[PDB]
Amino acid sequence: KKISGGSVVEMQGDEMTRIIWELIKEKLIFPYVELDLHSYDLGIENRDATNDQVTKDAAEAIKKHNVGVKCATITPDEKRVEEFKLKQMWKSPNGTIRNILGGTVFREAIICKNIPRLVSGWVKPIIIGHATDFVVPGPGKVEITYTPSDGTQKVTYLVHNFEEGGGVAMGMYNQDKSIEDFAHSSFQMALSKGWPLYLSTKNTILKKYDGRFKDIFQEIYDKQYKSQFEAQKIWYEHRLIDDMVAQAMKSEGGFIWACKNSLGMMTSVLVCPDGKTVEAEAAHGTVTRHYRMYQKGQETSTNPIASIFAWTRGLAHRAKLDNNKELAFFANALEEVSIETIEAGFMTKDLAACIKGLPNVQRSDYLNTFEFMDKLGENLKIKLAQAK
Amino acid sequence: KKISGGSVVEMQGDEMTRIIWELIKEKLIFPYVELDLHSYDLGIENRDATNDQVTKDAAEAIKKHNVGVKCATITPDEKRVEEFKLKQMWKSPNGTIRNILGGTVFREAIICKNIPRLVSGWVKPIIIGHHARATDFVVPGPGKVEITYTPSDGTQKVTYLVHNFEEGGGVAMGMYNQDKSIEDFAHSSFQMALSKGWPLYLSTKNTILKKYDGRFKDIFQEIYDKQYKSQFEAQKIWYEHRLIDDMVAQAMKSEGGFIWACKNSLGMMTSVLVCPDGKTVEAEAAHGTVTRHYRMYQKGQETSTNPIASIFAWTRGLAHRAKLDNNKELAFFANALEEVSIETIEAGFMTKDLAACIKGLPNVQRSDYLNTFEFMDKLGENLKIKLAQA
Ligand SMILES: NC(=O)C1=CN([C@@H]2O[C@H](COP(=O)(O)OP(=O)(O)OC[C@H]3O[C@@H](n4cnc5c(N)ncnc54)[C@H](OP(=O)(O)O)[C@@H]3O)[C@@H](O)[C@H]2O)C=CC1
Ligand SMILES: NC(=O)C1=CN([C@@H]2O[C@H](COP(=O)(O)OP(=O)(O)OC[C@H]3O[C@@H](n4cnc5c(N)ncnc54)[C@H](OP(=O)(O)O)[C@@H]3O)[C@@H](O)[C@H]2O)C=CC1
Ligand SMILES: CN(C)S(=O)(=O)c1cccc(NC(=O)c2nn(Cc3ccccc3)c(=O)c3ccccc23)c1
Ligand SMILES: CN(C)S(=O)(=O)c1cccc(NC(=O)c2nn(Cc3ccccc3)c(=O)c3ccccc23)c1
Known about the structure:
dimeric, isocitrate dehydrogenase, homodimer, oxidoreductase, NADPH, ten-stranded mixed beta sheet
């Protein structure tokens, strides 16, 4: 008998990831989990036919039901408008979704013990979370002004006085509200993983701009989170970007990195500040190149791990909201069986290339896209059997 | 006898690199080159005793004599202030020097055939270059933040909305860049590509900051088409622009052998500051003073510290010195020393950091590497042999 997963918003996408997405649902999710599924087709053809209305509806459904899992989508350009005869150059669905929900995007590289990283010392993964420009034609003043909405005196800052020749200039901003949300998402993400949190800035150069980030982070930590943080042996603390880069390379991993300023193993999750609404997806795109080969009837070897972890992160958050222990265990089992299958030597060509070097990869070093999905399916069914 | 190397500004540093620096001069430089040497002690204790005056004097010496070679130095923090009982937290000597000199910083990792790279496809080195002032402020509450340009001839006024704060306050910031500094960054990059016979790539994000980064691309190609394309085709190299997103992807898939102008083991990494005048250069290792190896040395333990990046700081400085003086003997020595350093490693003689790169630290044994003095002696023997056979 299957697990009652509850309410989940699902978004179908394009090209190669759309194929893999269906394989994930039919081979790894649906055989074990029943969902109250709010499905929205964000494939490029259906967004065009609905005048992108489906994208707004899917975002609204995430706001209402708190859990969304999204397949990679085509962001249109001139060639895409030509390829599909689009009515418009529709805005990227992720841009539309982020504006409606807000929050912070956190990305995490899944680590397999037999797949090399940048540094071998990285044993645990980490989670990293994250303008008006114009040309100055010639000599003149560039100023940035603040006009208070209550009529009090305007304030003018000289950006630069070009006395000989021109150049460029730009202005940037950040609302307090968005810094607060950034902090709230970062604290809640660190708690949800039991990991310490670091915020990096350059508040020594940008003493007012980056200083506002460092200040607001400490204020919200001290009042709302410091007591829950050591209640879980963790902490939060601010670094200058120079210190944190050095600390991260000498580190083993397992920390959240709020940064102010192989693709098949990159996850993304949009964490809203309320701690309730999350949207998970792969950090890569629709893999058009493999999709062309798939269209010509040729063999593909596309890495589905990042797409699988979109589902597992969403289902893990759903289970946390609903206190669904069976679903929470299932989400973990699906992640572990994914890592273990690769660590046992069964992987797609991209990962085999990371080990042997692309010029020396042979066909017997990897599985094609369909062979790998079947290997995961068989291993998943064995694992869940051994858990009863 | 010995080569007359001419005028060279030398800066001594701190901790383990200070030791390696003397070993390099004693065993590799002085036995073969006589120098009109302008030596400055940028050790932390001397910087404190002179109130950092030695750092400014060394920067001016590099301006005067056009060639500077610098050992790594301690940049003080709070614990350093207590360790040495410093009068104050002195600014990093590298920032001081960079501010007096200006220019473009080029970095390059030394490639050895038997030492793993991050990507196996990398078999030739690359050089990444960056050019060496914003007004940020607090937005106390709701209101309009605009940025405005008024040309000095008064014929117009352009106002751009940065953001209309409506429910609260926040922060805002204006930043600029001059054409002149973009031109310095272009000229240094084009000339560096010619000096090595490598193609040059510029990378920006002009898909988002289409005016800010677009002017970078514009100025590079104008300078290229009107001043450098003939020399690039004669050496059959080229220059192209790339969006940073695809340049990163292309770079991981490449073999190397190009200069990468960027808009945005450590013992094998060099850094060279090329000043706008095209004539003044300062070279140094891209790593620090290796404090923890120094602590091992202090307690009598054997150390195995990589001197390659420090050696190449000397060779780059000596090579540029020889180029300014048309000194064919000094130019031959500089290149010979670089060859000896790479050949020695490729022959299987290396310090522990490189052996760990190959085999992984848990599998390293003492017979897999040489200690700091053994490696320097091995380079000494091979340098003596190499020069004699000429
Ligand atoms: N979140 C989203 O919705 C995103 C969507 N896109 C969209 O995707 C489309 C194509 O973009 P593109 O530039 O190709 O970006 P992709 O992320 O699709 O990059 C594809 C390239 O990276 C490698 N790669 C990426 N994912 C995988 C994987 N899962 N398994 C194996 N290899 C992988 C492949 O390299 P190789 O060819 O060497 O095998 C492939 O050619 C565009 O229309 C774009 O709008 C792009 C980014 C994000
Ligand atoms: N150019 C300059 O003037 C710079 C100076 N510094 C200064 O140096 C001091 C210490 O800096 P730190 O943070 O230790 O960074 P370092 O670059 O001095 O060393 C950090 C680590 O990198 C490895 N390493 C670096 N260089 C070598 C080498 N030549 N051979 C073998 N291994 C090497 C060692 O790793 P392992 O321990 O694993 O062997 C070392 O512990 C600081 O006071 C800082 O101010 C820092 C940066 C630049
Ligand atoms: C790319 N820029 C130059 S940077 O963003 O400024 C920068 C600078 C320096 C270091 C890092 N990287 C990490 O600290 C890091 N990275 N990964 C992969 C990873 C990538 C993106 C998002 C999540 C994970 C890990 O798996 C890991 C594991 C243990 C410990 C650290 C790490 C990034
Ligand atoms: C912060 N960012 C992540 S990024 O610095 O912009 C970035 C992005 C992507 C790739 C690279 N790196 C390389 O393409 C590269 N790197 N090294 C090491 C090296 C380090 C410093 C200076 C010179 C060389 C090589 O030796 C090499 C050799 C052959 C071909 C390529 C390479 C950098």
